[PDB]
Structure formats: C-alpha cells, structure tokens
Design a protein around this ligand. Structure first.
Ligand SMILES: [Zn+2]
Lengths: 163, 163
C-alpha cells in the first residue's frame, strides 16, 4: 500500500515542527527549571498529542536532546547577533538551513533543522519579535518542501519512519 | 520554442512584485504628492528597470491605477483593523488572497493580488512593522506557486503575456 507522498509529508511538517517545539520547550523547562528561557508562545501553540505527527515531533525532541548538542550550542552563540525583523530572520534562516543540507540529507540534519527553527524562534521572541513562531514554522515547512527534504522523507517511508 | 515554465514564472514573481511595488509607490507619490503615505522601504528595494520582469511589473502598476480602484478602496478600509505581527499579516493575507481566486484566475485578479500585497505591506509599515516587505513578497510568490497562479500564467505565455 502507498505510504505518504511528498505532498502529504510536506503538509505534515507543520504539525511535526509545532510538536517538536512544544516538547523540546517542555524538556528545556525540565532540565533547566527557572534557568530555562521564557517563551509562552511555545507553550500555547496548537497541539494534538496523540496524533502520529504529534508523536513523531515528540520523539524527535527526545532524541534531539542527546544528538543535537553540537548543532545547538553553536546555534545559540551564532544567533546572538541576529536582528528582530522578518527579513533578517529569513536571511539567517535560509543561509543556515542551506548550509545544513549542502552535502545531502539525513535524519540528524532534519533534526538539526527543527532545532535551528526552535532556537531562531526563541531568539527573536527574546528580542521582542512576538507573533513570529508561525512564521518560523512556515520557513521550515517551505524550506523542506522546496529543498527536496520532504521528498527524501517520503522515500524513507514518511515522517513515521522517524519513530 | 518553449515559453516560461511554471517554475520559471513562480521565480519571476519576486521581481514582478518588487517592480509593481516600486512603480505603484512612485505613481502614488505623483498623484498624491505630500499626501502620499510614506514607506521608504518601497523606494529602496532591489530593482532592475530594464529587465523584462521590471517592465512587466511597471506595466501592471500602470494599468492597475485604472482597473484596481474598486479592489483598492476596500483593501484600505478593511486593513485598518490588522495588527502588526507576522501571524496576523499571514492570516489576513491568506484569507483575502484565497477569496480573490475562489472563482478562478484572471489577470485583473492577479493585479488585485499584487495590489493587496502593496496595501498590506504599506499598512504594517505604517503601524511600525519594519523589515517586512520581503515577507509580503514571499507571501505573494508562494501563494501564486501553490495556488496554481504561476501555472495559469505559464499557460497564458508567461508574465510577458501581461505586457
Ligand atoms: Zn512554497
């Protein structure tokens, strides 16, 4: 039977990324307590915990905690310099996302991209750019569609292959 | 010989919309003088006046002056209520763009979409959201790609068919 198409995977990315952000933020609160950076937008976003995509984004947040520390530490330092406008956010997002996939696609790099979206969203919020988390979501969804990441994931069996 | 593909047209939209915005803003300055709403972002954006897409966006700005007055007057009134965040801008953009093409595609509706992008960009700038004109450009480019407007234009002979 047919598994998810490129188009279905590309649509699914919205929910995977929202779920990743939610559970990653929850994990950061668990690990850092009152030291965790505040972003109420990441607590209140749309969530369907029991859905397959909700489960996938959660699992990527969990495994990301252990495999993404390298990509992450740098992201934090290399974002301190970004200005809170939509254009600067887009330009930075696009340069870094492009660099992550220059030598091909793998699951660790997909998780890195989700984590970079997370850090970017958090940074712009901390610098006063509210109402932008949906925009970072759309940056991620659209980048993965047009840069053939959704196609690659469909070829691996869809987002469920990440469970 | 092959004319522009869907993909080529979709890419061309960036330059068409930037050129439309530039020349429409110039026309508004010519018609309104010191009454024209200020948006320096629309004067300094990237422009290639002699290119085909630069010529097309200019022509759409000119013919738009006479055919878009209906769509426009309403846009101005119905945007007064939009809040300056990326999310609200996206949600409004998407609702209105969707409504414009619900009963199909024609050139007047394509110009209406460019004009709505113009008004939205101007509104959010006037309400303090700077650095967002590229974002409205990307809303327009991506909407026209995924809503098969670029495909329709390719079927008409490409953006040059609008000259
Ligand atoms: Zn797209």
């Amino acid at each position: 039977l047919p598994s998810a198409s490129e188009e279905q995977v590309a649509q699914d990315t919205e929910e995977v990324f929202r779920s990743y952000v939610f559970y990653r933020h929850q994990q950061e609160q668990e690990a850092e307590g009152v030291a965790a950076p505040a972003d109420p937008e990441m607590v209140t976003l749309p969530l369907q915990p029991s859905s397959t995509m909700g489960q996938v984004g959660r699992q990527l947040a969990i495994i990301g905690d252990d495999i993404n520390r390298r990509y992450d530490s740098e992201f934090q330092t290399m974002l301190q310099h970004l200005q809170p406008t939509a254009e600067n956010a887009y330009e930075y997002f696009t340069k870094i996302a492009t660099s992550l996939f220059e030598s091909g696609i793998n699951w660790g790099r997909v998780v890195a991209l989700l984590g970079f979206g997370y850090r970017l969203a958090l940074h712009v919020y901390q610098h006063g750019l509210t109402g932008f988390l949906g925009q970072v979501t759309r940056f991620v969804v659209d980048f993965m569609l047009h840069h053939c990441i959704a196609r690659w994931i469909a070829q691996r069996g869809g987002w469920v292959a990440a469970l």
